[PDB]
Every structure is written in structure tokens, then in C-alpha cells.
């Protein structure tokens, strides 16, 4: 609206585009504000507007010469600019630390700070607090306190994550041709894939039940692995060995027995395809190759056979067990889930056949190879 628009206007004047710096000092001296006539409460306001402007990127902030004695007034700085990198609050009369402790391990990207003429500078302990408050700081009071790179040699491994890898173009590209053939048939028709499976081939399902941290972008905090926990073969999760001997499936009939238990999927592969990092690597002694794939799929359908209706809860009246009324991991809904799949294929003159098939399903989460 027009009434708030002036507060938006003053930020434009006090932000310098080319130098990428936002000078905030002497707020009350804005000539455009005087025609209104003018407290101690406006400081949180801007900060909210700065995030929602969506047109200016700030990475340096000057806030000296504002007449402050306590830092609680600006505590909302960490909530708007986590990647701020150059703060100047010099020429102030702060003298204690309880109001500055609010930024513990925050402003990690910040690596330059000017706090000249402050009373804190005379203390002997002056060096110690920052050294933990801002681990990546390098320059303080225009004097070097850390050896730049020496820093950026610890906090960063010496290469960059690659989303695809393969020894040769002929081998690598052929695997993608296999993967496209394998996955598109997977969603549409389960019956045809038997011809790629040997009587010696073995298949298993592994389920990871860990909850991804909340800091991961687009993290799934309510996973639902209901249909997979009757067929999951996890060594460290279940200790009932007897069950593990039954989870493993060998042969043509056994593999398709599982294939109907799992719900129908549909991947946005060759469309959205930045997501599906895959590596393939040779298998010398058996003259085969190993294809490891990481990605996600959409459970668009439900399994035809429940496997818990023809034999499960055979006694009538009484329902199953933990009342799937939201209980347990939380249910058996239908929803997006990530997966890690590895392959072992032995080539043949007629056609390739799959030796082993491992499938690992986990809660949905973003990839690390993103940009």
C-alpha cells in the first residue's frame, strides 16, 4: 500500500547497487522522512522488507553511527541475511557480552568486520570470543587474525561433486540406454522383465527408516514405508535371522512375487533429469558391469495384492495390529520417496541378463549434486 511504500522507498536510497552495500547509519537523517515529522521500534521492520523485496541482493551492511548500546534491537539480522559478509557496527558504546551471545555460530559466511572505537577493543579477552562466534572470520579491525586459505583448506574438500561418471563413452552411454529401457518398462508392465532375469538371479529390498535433518531443503518429515516393511531385508535393522532366509527371493517365480507387492511407480526421468546421479563401473573377473543409481520415484498406484488380506488377519472381526490410524512410522499412504539402486549385469551374445538386483528406499530428500 501507499502508507508502507515510503519505508520501501528509503531502503532504495540507502542501498548502493554497484558496490552491493547497504548503508544504514543515521536513519533519522533521511530527508524524505522529515515531511512526515520523524522512536526505538522500527529496526525489525526494514529487515522483514529487505527479504521480501526480491530485487536487491545484499552481502554487505554498514550499521555504524546509529546510537546503540545493546544488540537485542537488531537481533533479527541473523534471520534475514544468513550469508551476510561484511558488518560495520563501529563507533558504539556496548560493554558486555550477554546481548551479543545471540549470534552463536551464526553469520558463518561473514568474514570481515570493523568495530573500531568500541570499548570492547581494549580487553585482553577481545580475541577469544570472536574466534568461536565467527569461525570463518579472517579480518577483524583491519588486521589479519586467521590465514585466509589455510581456513578454506579445512572447511572444503579439494574437489567438486560430479553427478555422472564412467570409464568410457561407449560403456557409460550404453548403461543409460539400459536404464531408460529398464525404468520405462518398470512403470508400465511388470510382466515383460522376467526375460532379463536368470534362475540364478536374486533380488532383495532394503528400507532405511532414518529421518532426514530439517535443514535439508524439501525434506520429508512424515515418511510412510508401510508396504515395504513386510519385504524389507535389512541386516542391521531386523535380528530375526529366520526371517532373512525368507526375505531373499531367487528364481523367476520368486522375483515376480515381490514385483506385485511393491506399488506402481512413475519417474520423471528423461523429463526432469538433473536428478538421478548415476555411476557405472566394470566387473573384471566376471566381465560384467555395476550400475549404481540414486534418485526418486512417485508412487502413483497401489499394489494389486496386499499380501496381508489372503492370509493376514485371517481371524475376522478383530483388526490387524497397531491400528494404522496414523500410528507407526505413520501409515501406508502414497507419496514421493527417494531410492538408491545398484545393478550387476553380465553381457551375452544374445541379450544381457541381470545377475543381482539391490533396491534401497529412504525418505525423500534433495540431491547434493544440485546447484
Amino acid at each position: 500500500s501507499d502508507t508502507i511504500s515510503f519505508l520501501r522507498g528509503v531502503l532504495l536510497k540507502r542501498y548502493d547497487p554497484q558496490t552491493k552495500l547497504l548503508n544504514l547509519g543515521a536513519l533519522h537523517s533521511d530527508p524524505e522522512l522529515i515531511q512526515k515529522g520523524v522512536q526505538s521500534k522500527m529496526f525489525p521492520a526494514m529487515m522483514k522488507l529487505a527479504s521480501t523485496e526480491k530485487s536487491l541482493i545484499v552481502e554487505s551492511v554498514n550499521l555504524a553511527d546509529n546510537q546503540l548500546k545493546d544488540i537485542s534491537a537488531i537481533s533479527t539480522l541473523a534471520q534475514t541475511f544468513p550469508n551476510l559478509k561484511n558488518l560495520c557496527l563501529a563507533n558504539n558504546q556496548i560493554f558486555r557480552f550477554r546481548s551479543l551471545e545471540v549470534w552463536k555460530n551464526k553469520f558463518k559466511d561473514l568474514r570481515e568486520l570493523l568495530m573500531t572505537n568500541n570499548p570492547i577493543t581494549t580487553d585482553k579477552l577481545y580475541r577469544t570470543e570472536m574466534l568461536r562466534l565467527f569461525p570463518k572470520l579472517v579480518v577483524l579491525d583491519n588486521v589479519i587474525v586467521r590465514d585466509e586459505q589455510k581456513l578454506q583448506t579445512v572447511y572444503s574438500l579439494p574437489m567438486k561433486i560430479q553427478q555422472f561418471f564412467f570409464e568410457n563413452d561407449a560403456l557409460g552411454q550404453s548403461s543409460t540406454d539400459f536404464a531408460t529401457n529398464f525404468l520405462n518398462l518398470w512403470d508400465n508392465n511388470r510382466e515383460q522383465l522376467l526375460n532379463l532375469y536368470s534362475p540364478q538371479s536374486q533380488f532383495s529390498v532394503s528400507v532405511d527408516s532414518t529421518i532426514p535433518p530439517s535443514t535439508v531443503t524439501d525434506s520429508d518429515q512424515t515418511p510412510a514405508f508401510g508396504y515395504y516393511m513386510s519385504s524389507s531385508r535389512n541386516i542391521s535393522k531386523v535380528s530375526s535371522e529366520k526371517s532373512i532366509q525368507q526375505r531373499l527371493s531367487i528364481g523367476q517365480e520368486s522375483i515376480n512375487s515381490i514385483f506385485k507387492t511393491l506399488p506402481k511407480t512413475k519417474h520423471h526421468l528423461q523429463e526432469q533429469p538433473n536428478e538421478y546421479s548415476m555411476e557405472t563401473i566394470s566387473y573384471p573377473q566376471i566381465n560384467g558391469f555395476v550400475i549404481t543409481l540414486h534418485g526418486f520415484f512417485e508412487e502413483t498406484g497401489k499394489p494389486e495384492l496386499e499380501s496381508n488380506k489372503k492370509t493376514g488377519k485371517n481371524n475376522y472381526q478383530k483388526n490387524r495390529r497397531y491400528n494404522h490410524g496414523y500410528n507407526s512410522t505413520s501409515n501406508n499412504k502414497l507419496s514421493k520417496k527417494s531410492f538408491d539402486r545398484t545393478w550387476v549385469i553380465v553381457p551375452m551374445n544374445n541379450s544381457v541378463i541381470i545377475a543381482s538386483d539391490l533396491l534401497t528406499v529412504r525418505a525423500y530428500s534433495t540431491g547434493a549434486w544440485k546447484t
Partner: protein
């Protein structure tokens, strides 16, 4: 001959928990031991999708420019390939790095121009999905040159971690 017995399955669980321990030790003199498990003649590591020709050089990497780590198993499963005499195991685990600000040797970033060692401060959890290729002699209680494949890759990461991937 699809061999599948519970006795063999137990050995796989402890062996995977054993290899991770060597990767987690900030020691340096003991590091020569972990080399013996890797195959000296032919071996094919892969760490975050960059190939390493030699296994020995990849271990001096883990001690020189990599901070202390602390893994945490969550899921393991395996499959024995008939005729091959080798088996493949799928491993999932978490990862923490010491974000205190010094490396394994114990040298800080501040330049010297002039109580014991502080306890390390750990960071957020990461995500790992590890595939490795082993032969079947591990069942026979011998661990010399038994590792032939090692695909250590990560699938997700948090934004709060100081490490840049």
C-alpha cells in the same frame, strides 16, 4: 548354488562395522594397517564421483586434508554372486565432520606471531550410500587384499554444515 545361511550374514554385519572404524581413526602411525585390506595389485576406489587409481594415495588423502569424521551405520544388505566367488554389499550410513576449526594433526588456522586437547565440536549429519565389492574369503577369517571395489558417494547434504560440497 545360491548359498544363503544366517551364519554368513552375521560376518557381513560386523565386517562393515569394522572397516568404518579404520576410516574414523585420527591416528597416523596405524594407518599402514588399513592398507593391507585393500588389494595392492588391482583396486578401483570411487569417492564422491572422482576416480582414484591407487588405494594407498587415497588413504594419505583421508589423513592430510580431511577433517575428523564419525560415521553411524543405518542399513546393510548383501548378495553372493554364484560362480564368481565374490559378493557385493550395499551400505548406508551418516557422517559428521569436526567443525571446530583444526585438522587431524592439530594445527589451527591462526598464525603464531609470538588442560589437555579441547574436545572436538561436531556438525550436522550428512548422507552416504556406499557400495563395495568383496570376495568370500572374509568368511574364512582372513583380511589381506580382500577389498576390490569401493564406491563411497553421498546423496544429500544440509545447508548449516560449514563444509562446501
Amino acid at each position: 548354488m545360491v548359498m544363503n545361511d544366517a551364519n554368513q550374514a552375521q560376518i557381513t554385519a560386523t565386517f562393515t562395522k569394522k572397516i568404518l572404524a579404520h576410516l574414523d581413526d585420527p591416528d597416523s602411525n596405524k594407518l599402514a594397517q588399513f592398507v593391507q585390506l585393500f588389494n595392492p595389485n588391482n583396486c578401483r576406489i570411487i569417492f564422491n564421483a572422482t576416480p582414484f587409481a591407487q588405494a594407498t594415495v587415497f588413504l594419505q588423502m583421508w589423513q592430510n586434508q580431511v577433517v575428523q569424521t564419525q560415521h553411524a551405520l543405518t542399513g546393510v544388505d548383501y548378495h553372493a554372486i554364484p560362480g564368481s566367488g565374490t559378493l557385493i554389499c550395499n551400505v548406508n550410513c551418516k557422517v559428521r565432520f569436526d567443525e571446530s576449526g583444526r585438522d587431524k594433526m592439530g594445527q589451527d588456522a591462526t598464525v603464531p606471531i609470538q588442560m589437555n586437547k579441547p574436545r572436538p565440536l561436531w556438525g550436522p549429519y550428512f548422507g552416504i550410500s556406499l557400495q563395495l565389492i568383496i570376495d568370500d574369503r572374509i568368511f574364512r577369517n582372513d583380511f589381506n587384499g580382500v577389498i576390490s571395489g569401493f564406491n563411497y558417494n553421498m546423496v544429500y547434504k544440509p545447508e548449516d554444515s560449514l563444509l562446501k560440497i
